[PDB]
Symmetry: C3
């Protein structure tokens, strides 16, 4: 199924007929970082499998719902169970849910992920406001926009120089200062490793040479689809480890260590994003 | 349809039966840079859609013709409307028209494109004679030759060290000096960004570190297919902008700015390539 | 055909019913470097085309057999004719033979390849023990594990930091010292160029900047599938040329020069790997 105007419109029509919520803000939350979704007010939970033209996710399994409702007085739509390109989803499958958000009225997209630290200032448990990226799949002919352009959503050749909204970064930092956790908050450049293997020790050393501050396996495809169709983005990485230190000390990483860091910062990230939602403009 | 000997032969047979021209030189022209094609003498215009085994291009639309005739007393064949890999065309679709040129008798291929400047000496409106490349899709398992080798055209493992003919670069520069525009002409290394998003500001900074002089979304696939089957190449980039300056000053790019630079240099590029065609050997 | 538990099990059942050998060690040998296979004791040769669910290889042609028997008193299984991703084989086709080795009992995988030298200490005819890698296809969304995870074999997010076993590297070097050819043996970082074009001169210069010691078109996909399912790896490159010197002197490479280097070192590599097999643990 192509992520075109007609197909996105059919999905949006279904959602509107079931939901009654017209959302202004969209959220996509990293693994272990989804507690905010279960606290959306006056919720409507819509399984992906019930929505016309949504991608099939039964091979991977696990949760996959669209959740609509209110947070801090604002109308929102959340993806509960996100689609990652290392699972084998196509460009068209990643793009369709973001384009449905656009047709529903979304103007701002908030994203979190788990990532590895490259910059030597980064510790496990730190947050990084993403200010730009290095897209190795895009340089290598696997950009999420490879294929025909869908003209109704955006231009053939997008400019990504303002993909990460500056004012939203400023608002996130201001709220951290108000609650005295600004010592955990950095800004940086995100490298997209297609995955699913963690970056090797020698790949980590290369990324340091190339000016990368953090590395992960998500987020950039969604940012590009959002920027193409005029949706503003705030993207925040939670740092699971410093891969450069681990390479120097011959120390291993694993998904269990990652999820324990997620549990340690989950409640603070929830509180932070609730206040960002309450206060952001447009 | 595979870009094999039998399929390329059927297309060449059709073209010969319609055209009567046996071309020695092939041309592929960048967007906004095609005025020379409309001035080919005693032309025959052949829509792609009429040629056996040519790739289907109706999803993208817009022009797609093969044009045969004479320029400066030489017999040529031009592609009017080129195929780019960011549109989703396969390896086999890109390669078949170049292999048809080979079977028709082409010995030299001349190529132009629009590109972004990385080297700090490059200004909007400058020309760059390409002397080598960095192929991010090829390093990343999306080389145009991935698949079975077509032995009738070339070897399994090509050497690209002389893909950009030195004497043709010398002839292009000599003609620029004769007409006193050599101050616009540079040489450099081309980075292939698969696209279709312009390189991000942080990707631009990385390319500077890695020794790239210009960046664009075309040309390298055609160069590799030509080199594989023994066709000599001259490739010239027209610089639309300096991406490193734009990153330092937080300035945007777009396809409209690119096309205005094309219009500013179109007539001079036309005159230059007409004289190159008239004078080149083999 | 997916490289899943059921499909790998059917292939293993066939092999066991024909072979009677339960191997502990697997070998994959580079082009021109396969003489050891023809000296396996009490051999059983099994054409790939006869084994349930093995990948189809008739488009490329040439040899494709699984060979089981004894070397130095150890039970082994060899791939005679390996599958390379530049031929167009999918992730699933590369992975299935390694997962069949796992089900047959393999605990150690020994690999050789031909490669280009980047580090200035490397000469034609030298050997490099691989200690880590830079996986350009993996960074670029063409990792061999992209797709659903096969949970019976390994985790969703593997750590590659110990993919190249340290003790096996130590054993290989010790045997070189015993036979007084340690002056030919180095260690280094391998860059995976998807291929099939040799790295361009300017790509070679980039790889030097990025800390790569050697570059080639194989090995990393097999290493990753082996590491995912808990098989220990030793990987050795035979250096055909120094690509950095060739770029400075404008000297060409070709498959014929590569194969002549293979012939020069074939008998010594055979003797070396026979002794490694005899002596390795686990
Ligand atoms: O604090 C507030 O809510 C405003 O003053 C504000 C809004 C914003 F989008 C960014 C800010 F840095 C600050
Ligand atoms: O000017 C001419 O036409 C020849 O002298 C010439 C031909 C060429 F291929 C390259 C040159 F630099 C010069
Ligand atoms: O020489 C032998 O066989 C053992 O002493 C040995 C075994 C090994 F796996 C690695 C070694 F460096 C040495």
């Amino acid at each position: 199924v192509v992520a075109n105007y007609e197909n996105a419109s059919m999905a949006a029509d279904y959602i509107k007929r079931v939901s009654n919520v017209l959302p202004d803000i969209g959220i996509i939350c990293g693994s272990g970082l989804g507690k905010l979704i279960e606290e959306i007010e006056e919720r409507k939970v819509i399984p992906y499998i019930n929505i016309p033209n949504f991608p099939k996710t039964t091979v991977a399994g696990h949760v996959g719902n669209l959740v609509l409702g209110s947070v801090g007085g604002r109308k929102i739509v959340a993806m509960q169970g996100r689609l990652h390109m290392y699972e084998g989803y196509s460009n068209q499958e990643i793009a369709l849910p973001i384009r449905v958000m656009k047709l529903l009225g979304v103007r701002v997209l908030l994203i979190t992920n788990l990532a590895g630290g490259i910059n030597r200032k980064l510790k496990s448990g730190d947050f990084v406001l993403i200010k730009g990226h290095i897209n190795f799949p895009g340089l290598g002919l696997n950009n999420v926009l490879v294929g025909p352009n869908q003209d109704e959503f955006g231009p053939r050749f997008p400019d990504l120089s303002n993909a990460y909204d500056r004012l939203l970064q400023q608002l996130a930092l201001k709220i951290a200062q108000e609650n005295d956790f600004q010592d955990l908050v950095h800004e940086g450049v995100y490298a997209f490793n297609g995955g699913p293997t963690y970056e090797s020790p020698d790949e980590s050393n290369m990324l340091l040479k190339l000016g990368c501050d953090v590395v992960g396996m998500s987020t950039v495809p969604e940012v590009i689809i959002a920027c193409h169709c005029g949706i503003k983005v705030l993207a925040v990485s939670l740092i699971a480890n410093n891969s450069i230190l681990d390479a120097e000390n011959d120390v291993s990483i694993n998904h269990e260590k990652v999820l324990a860091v997620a549990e340690k910062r989950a409640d603070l990230l929830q509180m932070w994003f609730k206040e960002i939602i309450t206060r952001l403009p447009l």
